[PDB]
Amino acid sequence: VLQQTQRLDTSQKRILELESHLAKKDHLLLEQKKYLEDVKLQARGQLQA
Amino acid sequence: VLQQTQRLDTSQKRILELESHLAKKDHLLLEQKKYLEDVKLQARGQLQAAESRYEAQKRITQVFELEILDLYGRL
Amino acid sequence: GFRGVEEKKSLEILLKDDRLDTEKLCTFSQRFPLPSMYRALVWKVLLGILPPHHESHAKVMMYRKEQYLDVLHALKVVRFVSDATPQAEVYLRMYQLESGKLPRSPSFPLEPDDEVFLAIAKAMEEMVEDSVDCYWITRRFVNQLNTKYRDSLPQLPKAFEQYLNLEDGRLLTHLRMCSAAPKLPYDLWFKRCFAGCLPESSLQRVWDKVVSGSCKILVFVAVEILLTFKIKVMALNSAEKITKFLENIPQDSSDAIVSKAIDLWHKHCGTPVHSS
Amino acid sequence: YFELVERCADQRPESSLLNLISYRAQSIHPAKDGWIQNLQALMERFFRSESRGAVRIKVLDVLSFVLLINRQFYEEELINSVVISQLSHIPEDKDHQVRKLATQLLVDLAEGCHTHHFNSLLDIIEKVMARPPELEERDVAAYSASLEDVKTAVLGLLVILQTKLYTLPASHATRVYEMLVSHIQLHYKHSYTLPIASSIRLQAFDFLLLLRADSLHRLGLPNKDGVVRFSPYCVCDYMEPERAVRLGSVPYSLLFRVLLQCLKQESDWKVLKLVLGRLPESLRYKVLIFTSPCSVDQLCSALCSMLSGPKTLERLRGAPEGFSRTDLHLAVVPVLTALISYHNYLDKTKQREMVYCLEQGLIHRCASQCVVALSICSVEMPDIII
């Protein structure tokens, strides 16, 4: 039981770390999505001219 | 002990899944950066394609302009 | 109160961003006047002459200047225009060429659409210094009239008849007793957008709003025209006399006319609210 | 040109609209501005407001290809903008090919979709599965194809469950299991009889009976190689929803209850041959039955009453031409043999009936199984084997 609770606590903390890291990755993906939207908006903005 | 072992295994497989998730999101971010650079490159290609269209039509109008100036000169 | 400073600095903040938010610029243009130094820029951005991204303005203005010079040189080549041709007629011929509606020779009489564009072009000349900028602003404005407001402009006369009563019912009753309501100059007010009716120094305050999506500002400009001339209109007594007076209103009170028309349009259609 | 074709689409031949859709599909990828809006417009015009079958199939295939390529990055945006907004009317759709292909699309999409839009995709699959007094002998076969979308929807639920069981959030597999089970129970509520419904029940039961569980309550399923993978998130255990990593309560009682109804009401022998063929193996896992509101008493009652009365043979259809009460004995005796292990959890009247069924089996070709079973009954059930 003691070994399992040490491992439970460490793995739950690791999960929280990984979830925060994954949230950061998702935020970066959303930012790059709107960066591509911005990029192609600029590109068609002078392609239309 | 069964519940505790189950809680660990949920967490430990979830760690492997979350690490594959972080790896996959990093690889998706990399391929997305590459795709943004490719759409930026296609932007240059399409802009220069439009420029070439304009230059070709400009030359066509140049030939017709010289024809018009010649025909007017002959009047 | 230094509210002019607040307006100018807010617009400079809206213009500082590497990407100009056309929606925020439209809302600002609704809520406030444009400072004259940024009017041509903001009109170009809202009319789509310049795209939202500020970096692209140099290359896009190169494109606009190239297109202007190409169309102008083409009109010179087919001898449609000349150096003597007035700048407004030059813009009209450029617009006709770019829209494929150029006649066989300049001696062909102008169509009503041509006269409307010519009137707006004449008004634009006094507002926009640069010939390329003036032409592009003119063409996009007239194209907005034919595309963004092809259905809205015909409704404007009825909106005039409504809001005119809603601010002074007895005045519209005075007009209808003359049965002159359908003979009022709606083609001037709403096809030519008061071009040639108001001095351009204050017609530009109207056109700020017309560029930013509001053609009801035209309705309220006409309403404030007739409210400002209540002393004269209530002394008018014939349909033709009213029509001729409304096409040649005194220009002294025009600054106040447009100011109070914007006040009336902010009162009846509410104050614009920034989006959350 | 294709703007003109779009503005005269109603009058065009179908191949012209196919070319238009291919062209617009070219226009739909993340490199092009407003590609989501372009796809939404194509979907609206040529699926939502078009009634020709091939054109809608082509636009549905365009959407399928767009999802196949661009679910890498834009899955959520596409689902919100296009799929939920356009395919939601598929249950009311009148084209059978279009409905079948649309639930195949929604299924293939929901299998991988682990966002909070999986519930929205299962909404459309469910409303498809939520599906006559007059039929002529050949018109039965022609009409039968009008339900293949129900088939692809539920066989799609099988694929979706085989994926979603091992992936969070665990409510996804929970909903798929509830839909699969409540639908295979709707079969008995409505007493469906068509061969499509028979095959649906067969395939669904074949998948469902393969749900194993380890000592850790974790559910499991075999891979292609037949090796069981136990789920780290979905557990057979009953949780009351009334007043840490969240865990998927996938209680075996729902599947068990519909197994009871399959024993009591099924008519297709190919299904009972399967349910009886896989019940002994499933009954090995006492974790399944005990951790959920299962009723072993009802199970023994179903099997014993199946053997005791002739009514089962008056209920069965599609059995082999020589099927007899003896064949029913051969099939049920294995389940009773495995059911002996639940003696402490069976009512003694049911134990007496089960012992009586095993005793009755000594007449038939399963005499060896009955004698072996009765030996264990002697050790385990002395107060009733006396």
Swiss-Prot record, chain A:
Highly expressed in skeletal muscle, followed by heart, brain, placenta, pancreas, lung, liver and kidney. Also expressed in embryonic kidney cells. It is found in: Lysosome membrane; Cytoplasm, Cytosol. Non-catalytic component of the TSC-TBC complex, a multiprotein complex that acts as a negative regulator of the canonical mTORC1 complex, an evolutionarily conserved central nutrient sensor that stimulates anabolic reactions and macromolecule biosynthesis to promote cellular biomass generation and growth. The TSC-TBC complex acts as a GTPase-activating protein (GAP) for the small GTPase RHEB, a direct activator of the protein kinase activity of mTORC1. It is linked to Tuberous sclerosis 1: An autosomal dominant multi-system disorder that affects especially the brain, kidneys, heart, and skin. It is characterized by hamartomas (benign overgrowths predominantly of a cell or tissue type that occurs normally in the organ) and hamartias (developmental abnormalities of tissue combination). Clinical manifestations include epilepsy, learning difficulties, behavioral problems, and skin lesions. Seizures can be intractable and premature death can occur from a variety of disease-associated causes. Lymphangioleiomyomatosis: Progressive and often fatal lung disease characterized by a diffuse proliferation of abnormal smooth muscle cells in the lungs. It affects almost exclusively young women and can occur as an isolated disorder or in association with tuberous sclerosis complex. The C-terminal putative coiled-coil domain is necessary for interaction with TSC2. This is Hamartin. It comes from Homo sapiens. The gene is TSC1.
From Swiss-Prot, chain C:
GO terms for cellular component: ciliary basal body; cytoplasmic vesicle; cytosol; lysosomal membrane; TSC1-TSC2 complex. The keyword Transmembrane does not apply. InterPro entries: Rab-GAP-TBC_dom, Rab-GAP_TBC_sf, TBC1D7, TBC1D7_dom2. Keywords: Cytoplasm, Cytoplasmic vesicle, GTPase activation, Lysosome, Membrane. Residues 33-214 form the Rab-GAP TBC domain. It is linked to Macrocephaly/megalencephaly syndrome, autosomal recessive: An autosomal recessive disorder characterized by abnormal enlargement of the cerebral hemispheres, intellectual disability, large head, optic atrophy and underdeveloped skeletal musculature. Head enlargement may be evident at birth or the head may become abnormally large in the early years of life. Additional clinical features include behavioral abnormalities, psychosis, learning difficulties, prognathism, myopia and astigmatism. Non-catalytic component of the TSC-TBC complex, a multiprotein complex that acts as a negative regulator of the canonical mTORC1 complex, an evolutionarily conserved central nutrient sensor that stimulates anabolic reactions and macromolecule biosynthesis to promote cellular biomass generation and growth. The TSC-TBC complex acts as a GTPase-activating protein (GAP) for the small GTPase RHEB, a direct activator of the protein kinase activity of mTORC1. PROSITE patterns: TBC_RABGAP. The keyword Membrane applies. GO terms for molecular function: GTPase activator activity; small GTPase binding; TSC1-TSC2 complex binding. This is TBC1 domain family member 7. GO terms for biological process: activation of GTPase activity; cellular response to starvation; negative regulation of cilium assembly; negative regulation of TOR signaling; negative regulation of TORC1 signaling; positive regulation of GTPase activity; positive regulation of protein ubiquitination; response to growth factor. Highly expressed in heart, and slightly in kidney, liver and placenta. It comes from the Eukaryota. Coiled coil: none annotated.
Curated annotation (Swiss-Prot), chain D:
It is found in: Lysosome membrane; Cytoplasm, Cytosol. Signal peptide: none annotated. It comes from the Eukaryota. Liver, brain, heart, lymphocytes, fibroblasts, biliary epithelium, pancreas, skeletal muscle, kidney, lung and placenta. Phosphorylation by AMPK activates it and leads to negative regulation of the mTORC1 complex. Ubiquitinated by the DCX(FBXW5) E3 ubiquitin-protein ligase complex, leading to its subsequent degradation. Ubiquitinated by MYCBP2 independently of its phosphorylation status leading to subsequent degradation; association with TSC1 protects from ubiquitination. It is linked to Tuberous sclerosis 2: An autosomal dominant multi-system disorder that affects especially the brain, kidneys, heart, and skin. It is characterized by hamartomas (benign overgrowths predominantly of a cell or tissue type that occurs normally in the organ) and hamartias (developmental abnormalities of tissue combination). Clinical manifestations include epilepsy, learning difficulties, behavioral problems, and skin lesions. Seizures can be intractable and premature death can occur from a variety of disease-associated causes. Component of the TSC-TBC complex (also named Rhebulator complex), composed of 2 molecules of TSC1, 2 molecules of TSC2 and 1 molecule of TBC1D7. Probably forms a complex composed of chaperones HSP90 and HSP70, co-chaperones STIP1/HOP, CDC37, PPP5C, PTGES3/p23, TSC1 and client protein TSC2. Probably forms a complex composed of chaperones HSP90 and HSP70, co-chaperones CDC37, PPP5C, TSC1 and client protein TSC2, CDK4, AKT, RAF1 and NR3C1; this complex does not contain co-chaperones STIP1/HOP and PTGES3/p23. This is Tuberin. The chain holds residues 407 to 820 of 1807 of the full protein.
